[model samples]
Target chain A: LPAEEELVEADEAGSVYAGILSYGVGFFLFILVVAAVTLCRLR
Target chain B: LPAEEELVEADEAGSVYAGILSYGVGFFLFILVVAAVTLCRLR
Candidate 1:
């Protein structure tokens, strides 16, 4: 009972973070990369 | 009335979604910057 909640919360937070973390960072990076490539193409 | 002052539903699911979205996006960026900094330092 003591560490159960801690473990549960840790697992939940980690899972949520893992799932969205990649999406968020990947989206930002994808956008950044596209912008860079586009800028290079424009010039 | 236009929107009844946008009365809140207080739906638990909707509220949880809103909270998670905020934290998800925020922490994602936070971890991203940390990763970038870590990468730069490692290099």
Candidate 2:
């Protein structure tokens, strides 16, 4: 169960990073679109 | 203290509305920009 144990041990880092990775990247991408749209519309 | 007293009384409505107006508007803009960038790049 080394893999399982290792996964569990790394769970904190991986889970947090991976979780935030998608969330952070997702949110990050979302914001850029909004800016482009607004700027495009305004100008 | 009419305005002062009335403001506090209407705080629940006006305060929350105005506060969220900027926050909502701001957060809204943020998302659009992110989407635009992601799409533009992907395409």
Candidate 3:
């Protein structure tokens, strides 16, 4: 295979992983914020 | 009692996510390379 095609294949997977991680983190932060607020209110 | 602390908490989580993502991408690329080489050899 050509070097450029290999690079493109690797990058396509990399970008997909990065996109999924971004959404996973956003979801985590949403839950974290809600939990923090709840804890603050409870005290 | 402080905005800085809240920022720190968010950053801590963000950094953790980044660290995990770095490892994940490394692993993904490793697999991608292996698959590509295998496919190239098969043809």
Candidate 4:
């Protein structure tokens, strides 16, 4: 029972971590793309 | 050796791919701008 609960918590934590990692990467890529496009257009 | 070769290929491939991605995004935006302008003219 204890092992199962710990494993469940581990899975949830991993899911949250994975979500954050994806969001961070997506936002970074988004900013780079926006910057490049806007820079090319305005510059 | 094979893996190392693949890694280097990916390194250069990514560089060109990134440039293409930037260009592709900018072109897409350019099209959108043109379309919007044409639509406004037609309206």
Best by TM-score: 1
Worst lDDT window (10 residues) for model 3 chain A? A2-11
Clashing pairs in 4: none
TM-score ranking from best candidate downward: 1, 3, 4, 2
Writing each residue's lDDT as its tens digit, candidate 2 over B2-43 gives: 121111111122344345345445555565675567557664
Candidate 4's DockQ is 0.03
Candidate 1 matches the true fold with a TM-score of 0.35
> What does candidate 2's lDDT look like per residue over A1-30, in tens digits?
354432211122323324434544555556
Select the stronger candidate by lDDT from 3 and 4.
3
lDDT of 1 by residue, B1-43 (tens): 2222222323333444457565557756775676566546654
Cα lDDT tens digits, model 4, A1-43, are 3544322111223333345444445545665676567556654
How many pairs collide in each candidate, listed in order?
0, 17, 0, 0
Off by over 4 Å in 4: A1-13, B1-43
| Candidates 2 and 3 compared by TM-score, better number | 3
Better of 1 and 3 by lDDT: 1
Contacts from the true interface found in each model, as a fraction, amount to 0.08, 0.03, 0.03, 0.00
Candidate 3 docking class: incorrect
TM-scores for candidates 1 onward, in order: 0.35, 0.31, 0.34, 0.32
Query: Interface RMSD (Å), each candidate?
Result: 11.0, 16.3, 17.0, 12.9
Give the residue spans of candidate 3 off by over 4 A: A1-19, A22-43, B1-10
Model 4 residue A34 CA deviation (Å) reads 1.1
